[PDB]
């Protein structure tokens, strides 16, 4: 039932009241990976650090760190 | 470490160390660098506001899961 993209926005999202949609992003990557029920990981978008763009694909470093945590969290 | 600094806009998990001058980028990385309790105070970008208990709870929850080996 899970979807193909996820939005995380440090400044505009909430982990409390957000759902990882573009309209209502999560706030954190820790919150996001908690949601991920199966692989493949959805494509995660983050704040663009540029004034020009709202959104930007997660960095490769940030993704790898989230996934490390996710796998280890899948081992109870 | 008594106070950890985390900055999505300006920090780095790669070259940062959680100092106010070299903040971490995420709480994800920050928790990974805490090996003992009690936790340092965590400050996030607003400039700096202390971490919302709403996200601190998540960080301190996932940190306890880690410590089990
Ligand atoms: Cl995070
Ligand atoms: Zn896997
Ligand atoms: Zn404890």
UniProtKB/Swiss-Prot annotation, chain B:
Location of the protein in the cell: Cytoplasm
UniProt-reported outcome of changing residue 9 to P: In NEDMILG; uncertain significance; decreased protein levels in patient cells
Segments of this protein annotated with the region Disordered: 2-23
Impact reported for residue 15 to M: In NEDMILG; decreased protein levels in patient cells; decreased asparagine-tRNA ligase activity in patient cells
Residues recorded with modification Phosphoserine: 54
Biased segments, Basic and acidic residues type: 6-23
Domain statement: The N-terminal domain (1-77) recruits and activates specific immune cells by interacting with CCR3-expressing cells.
Job of this protein: Catalyzes the attachment of asparagine to tRNA(Asn) in a two-step reaction: asparagine is first activated by ATP to form Asn-AMP and then transferred to the acceptor end of tRNA(Asn). In addition to its essential role in protein synthesis, acts as a signaling molecule that induced migration of CCR3-expressing cells. Has an essential role in the development of the cerebral cortex, being required for proper proliferation of radial glial cells.
Subunit note: Homodimer.
Other notes: Autoantibodies to NARS1, are often detected in sera from patients with interstitial lung disease (ILD).
Family as reported in the entry's similarity comment: Belongs to the class-II aminoacyl-tRNA synthetase family.
Illness the protein is tied to: Neurodevelopmental disorder with microcephaly, impaired language, and gait abnormalities: An autosomal recessive neurodevelopmental disorder characterized by global developmental delay apparent in infancy, moderate to profound intellectual disability, poor or absent speech and language, delayed walking with variable gait abnormalities, and progressive microcephaly. Additional variable features include hypotonia, early-onset seizures, and a peripheral demyelinating or axonal peripheral sensorimotor neuropathy.
Protein name per the record: Asparagine--tRNA ligase, cytoplasmic
Organism: Homo sapiens (Human)
Lineage of origin: Eukaryota, Metazoa, Chordata, Craniata, Vertebrata
Residues of the full protein shown: 4 to 76 of 548
